[PDB]
Symmetry: D2
Subunit: 336 residues, 4 copies
Amino acid sequence: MTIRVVINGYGRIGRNILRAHYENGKKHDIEIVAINDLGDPKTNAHLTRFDTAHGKFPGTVTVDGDYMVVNGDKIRVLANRNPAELPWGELGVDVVLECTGFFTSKEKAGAHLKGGAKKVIISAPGGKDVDATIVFGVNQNVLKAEHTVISNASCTTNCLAPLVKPLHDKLGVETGLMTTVHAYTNDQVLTDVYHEDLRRARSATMSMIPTKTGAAAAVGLVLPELNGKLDGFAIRVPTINVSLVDLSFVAKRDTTVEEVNSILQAAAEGELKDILTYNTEPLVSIDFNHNPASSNFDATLTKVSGKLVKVSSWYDNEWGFSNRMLDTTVALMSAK
Amino acid sequence: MTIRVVINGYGRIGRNILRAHYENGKKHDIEIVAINDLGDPKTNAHLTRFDTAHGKFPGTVTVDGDYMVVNGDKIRVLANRNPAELPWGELGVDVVLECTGFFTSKEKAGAHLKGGAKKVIISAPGGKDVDATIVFGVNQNVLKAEHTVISNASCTTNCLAPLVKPLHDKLGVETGLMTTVHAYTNDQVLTDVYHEDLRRARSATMSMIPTKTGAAAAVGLVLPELNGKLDGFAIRVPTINVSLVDLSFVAKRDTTVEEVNSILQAAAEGELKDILTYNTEPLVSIDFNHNPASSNFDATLTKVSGKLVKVSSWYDNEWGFSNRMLDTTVALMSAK
Amino acid sequence: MTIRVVINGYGRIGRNILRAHYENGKKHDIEIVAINDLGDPKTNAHLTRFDTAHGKFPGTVTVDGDYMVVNGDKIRVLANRNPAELPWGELGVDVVLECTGFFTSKEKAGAHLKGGAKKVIISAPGGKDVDATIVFGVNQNVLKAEHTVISNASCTTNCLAPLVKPLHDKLGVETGLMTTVHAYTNDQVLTDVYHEDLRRARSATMSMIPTKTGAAAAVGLVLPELNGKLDGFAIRVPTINVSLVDLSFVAKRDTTVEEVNSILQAAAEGELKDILTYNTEPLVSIDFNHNPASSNFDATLTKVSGKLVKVSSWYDNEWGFSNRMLDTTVALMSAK
Amino acid sequence: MTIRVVINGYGRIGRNILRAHYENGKKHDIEIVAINDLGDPKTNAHLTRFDTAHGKFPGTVTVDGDYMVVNGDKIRVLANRNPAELPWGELGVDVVLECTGFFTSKEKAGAHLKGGAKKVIISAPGGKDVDATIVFGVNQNVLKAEHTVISNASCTTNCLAPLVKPLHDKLGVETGLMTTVHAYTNDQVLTDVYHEDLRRARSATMSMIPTKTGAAAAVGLVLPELNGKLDGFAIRVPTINVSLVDLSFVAKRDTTVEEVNSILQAAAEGELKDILTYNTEPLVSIDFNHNPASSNFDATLTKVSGKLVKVSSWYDNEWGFSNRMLDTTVALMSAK
Ligand SMILES: NC(=O)c1ccc[n+]([C@@H]2O[C@H](COP(=O)([O-])OP(=O)(O)OC[C@H]3O[C@@H](n4cnc5c(N)ncnc54)[C@H](O)[C@@H]3O)[C@@H](O)[C@H]2O)c1
Ligand SMILES: NC(=O)c1ccc[n+]([C@@H]2O[C@H](COP(=O)([O-])OP(=O)(O)OC[C@H]3O[C@@H](n4cnc5c(N)ncnc54)[C@H](O)[C@@H]3O)[C@@H](O)[C@H]2O)c1
Ligand SMILES: NC(=O)c1ccc[n+]([C@@H]2O[C@H](COP(=O)([O-])OP(=O)(O)OC[C@H]3O[C@@H](n4cnc5c(N)ncnc54)[C@H](O)[C@@H]3O)[C@@H](O)[C@H]2O)c1
Ligand SMILES: NC(=O)c1ccc[n+]([C@@H]2O[C@H](COP(=O)([O-])OP(=O)(O)OC[C@H]3O[C@@H](n4cnc5c(N)ncnc54)[C@H](O)[C@@H]3O)[C@@H](O)[C@H]2O)c1
Ligand SMILES: [Mg+2]
Ligand SMILES: [Mg+2]
Ligand SMILES: [Mg+2]
């Protein structure tokens, strides 16, 4: 039975989820029945057709009344800031993909359930009250049919976890510290102006901006063996998309650059295929734009000094995450 | 008699109004008694001390309870989104500088008057209901004591009007069309996302973005003789500050590059001194950052072909406009 | 009769000429037999495969000894700064596409002829000695079989000329002044450093930079009727690709916005089809990236005030020009 | 006896050396007697007066014939690409500050000595044949009167060495790996074009670009205790100036975040004062623009997990290094 999905927050993640669904041929047994944002149908259709970071949408998009028509599929357009008022029950919604950035707790995201939706996937780290936190390819097996509000973790955690898992299995990680150099996002500002975070109040276009992230510690939620073993922070830089994870960790035994790279190569070819990739070419961040993988390990950058290991992975923070959202949706509805 | 002033919206314009006041030694007989924004005093103080576009504030800023202290002057900090609830009558406010971007009509901005303020200057084009629209140096003479809500026009209009006035008097403008190449502002977005304007919905950092502006037609409000003679549009480009007006017009008689430049040079040395400047050096936009003039005519760019004339003027859209706000405040309170 | 072509200077224009040739299915009866630059085959192949502005090359590129193999075609790679030493005669070169920026006169470009090449097309405005200057779609009819060194004009002139030609025929242009807001190019600098042009010595990333261009006057070379009637300058802004022509002109008779737009729509559908395009959608510069047209007229921006008319056209300064180089190559070898 | 200095290569470093000398009141007993570049005196004077990254020069610059006059000091302007032809003997030059980026070995930089100069300081890592490599504040004691060609190391090594030295002394470093997120430099490119380094061949403005750096290994040259213990690489990001060192190392014993910060605070107040600074404010990269320190340690970013420690230091890669060049100049001439 096809899963009926709606996207609440038709932004970078929300739109790129819809785009990923259509660009991959609707591989997932999913039908997008509705989207909700602040704009009218003309605005949502226009932003779907033309994108700066990802170019023009391959398919056709037209407007017909209250509907945005994508490759012949009529998708109802809503503009209501309050989730509890959205007509999810009447549309028979199975899963709400919550991508506004404003309802990341189970209490807040549960407003969709009052509206009549069966389940909700938060497109960000959730509050402590969420039923599960999922990095697809790593721990989707923990999902249960009773789960109703889950988190798909962060783009950073979806890159770090598939990177660290094979290294912990074969070498073991005693402890690790991570820095992610990350593209700016729409929570930042063009020129200095009010923000809750004093550093994010500074022009994203002009500076390297340190900001806190829980992505490294959050790997403990998806891989419990690494709980308490990873910490880190982010440096936001003036790029529109694509980010880099830079993980330094102390391994349990001595290792080499060649062994470390071999471990990740085997993982990319086997268990973690299409989630983790292995790259040996002299590439830059833009070359991974529109790459759907969660973690693009760059073997060219690996450094080893005794037990200290530095591994680096590129990730399209919009495209990889958005494709994983569709994967997690199918897993949640299939979970027993 | 010192004018008691408050800033509603302590953003790019609001903060640089306060900065300009203190950097020039409080030359204007003005005391900034309070500011209002969304943040706490610590946030407003930090953004005052450090700015990307304009560097570090020369003076001292400290926090004391609900007050921000700038060079020993205690300034009350407020955070209330509703202007009618602000305690302007209790603070004895003479003039409210409205810089939020949300109350640009006389009806909406009049909420300050109910709160107890005597007068309001909107830092943007006002609605048709405003008492006056002022480009200081051009038409402040129209101000009256009965005026309570006025507009200081736009940054673009404050640049275009002093440029076009001297040319009209000596050569005459049959008609004119204008393009302003303009730095991005906080109304724009970092990566494509909802906006009321479909072009402003596109990444400011990556594209030249056409947007409508009323600055050219608005020159008719300040100079009725030019009403109906100027039109134009804007192109937003990826710069953090400083913009350029590019005016092409048909003069009433044939002229030359040398005559055009001489007319504006004379205006800069006399009637329009310090509002309009005359530049002959081979400079770029960043060289006009922190220039307080409304219109920096660049003589090196002048082109003339018979009756057609192209003149260009640089303007710091934040710094020049913010200084003009202080000028218009004194003029408004002196009006008889 | 397949034309044997070589690219001297495998830079932005040189590489995108080859990309354009393979992406359109080698529609032109052209075979690129060799390229010349400063690097080894590994470097030229890598830059062919991955590009920031235009993304991944759709085809396959490999290296085999001194050859770069593109979709099965073996292309000799040379690294010699002196054209007279290049092996054009042994390769049977019909046309050298001169894209280094260093041999822009007939005397300098003639070094290729000494090397054994029959003809040379300079990818930029030529010196006074060049045999012809060509904007394809406008004046390729002037080419003659005895011509040996020609110029393909500038990107700007290839945008302006197809725009102004239909307007002169239907309305007449008395005179006009133009401003082109233009992406930075590799002759500019990242942070202030020596340059012959003192304004181009300033950071391209941080400022709007006025620079002289002969593109407007050069329209007289391709449309002699307009000789002496057009002048202008450029403003380089921080975008990596895609530029805008903004032409203000006095028409010979009064007109309207609707009539101006109709004239250009008819031309785009007829005589100038695929060279000039007609756009009515609310787009920004990035949306014309990888558009092969020479001039993408934006009807949404048209302004008319009496006789003064402002028309604006977008152009991909790399992609449109590079596609026109292929057209002009065929036209040159077909000339009788 | 005042040290007579000349600058060979009046670029980012060369010009900022002169600006640092004059802005700090010519504290050093140094007189800049001449500069050498590719341009004429008017071009060099203009670039001295106006800078994008560092704003306008506080002093006065005029041109008089072949001389540039800075705050009343006559400085000879030369334009000769071969050091052996420069008239250093006739000018009585004590020290040549070699800042072109083209003569970084002792053999190449020795051409200045044949030109008649007594000594040469390379403004970059030197070849292995250089007499010494100096991080001022760390190992200037090794300088000798017989030294004639030395290296002032790299901006990165001058930031890393003062950061790591106090931590090694009090805690001990078993091993360490470094990442420096670094502003782009004029060696990189605006849009993809030939470069010896295939990643630096990619647009600096659009991507995060991994590049090799010897800064980590080079700390072994200035502190033999650390030879072989540090390795790393750099990531160039789209910022015009200011960089960040991110050092992860395994300490010999367990420690805490507070202890690490205390060691560096004591070092900043004592042995390494004015070389190393201690910051506790929530700042971003631009806030350290024009900071003369070699290493601006940011205590807010420190992370510690047992023996694994991650410390971060900001450095203005132009301004800090340029000021250190003046320090090293005096130390070299004072050496016995
Ligand atoms: N962009 C990334 O790199 C990235 C990666 C992983 C996760 N995320 C997470 O995804 C979420 C969305 O981030 P984004 O970058 O897509 O943000 P965005 O600002 O691009 O998009 C948010 C969208 O939601 C709309 N919106 C806001 N409030 C709304 C409301 N009350 N009701 C309906 N629509 C509303 C906005 O108009 C906008 O279209 C956040 O939780 C973010 O942390 C982002
Ligand atoms: N920036 C320019 O170049 C420029 C030039 C001329 C005029 N203006 C005009 O000035 C106004 C301000 O623009 P800006 O560039 O400073 O924008 P901004 O976003 O930098 O500043 C807006 C400020 O108002 C605050 N704010 C928002 N809603 C508020 C509310 N209800 N109550 C109190 N504070 C509130 C925000 O937190 C922010 O500090 C706009 O009307 C704009 O068009 C701007
Ligand atoms: N980029 C544009 O927008 C554009 C548009 C139209 C025309 N043009 C013209 O095309 C020409 C090249 O511009 P570009 O943007 O491609 O510049 P570029 O700097 O990207 O490319 C120049 C290439 O030539 C190589 N080169 C330099 N000297 C050489 C020599 N002696 N022998 C062989 N190769 C050499 C360089 O390594 C580089 O690959 C110029 O005349 C320019 O004005 C550029
Ligand atoms: N800019 C930095 O952040 C930085 C920091 C530390 C070290 N460095 C090093 O300093 C050196 C200079 O780098 P930069 O960033 O100032 O480079 P740059 O490209 O800004 O400046 C180089 C200057 O040298 C001139 N020049 C070139 N060839 C010349 C010649 N033959 N004779 C005279 N002048 C010549 C150029 O015109 C230009 O003015 C390099 O070795 C670089 O690695 C740079
Ligand atoms: Mg009240
Ligand atoms: Mg030969
Ligand atoms: Mg000599």
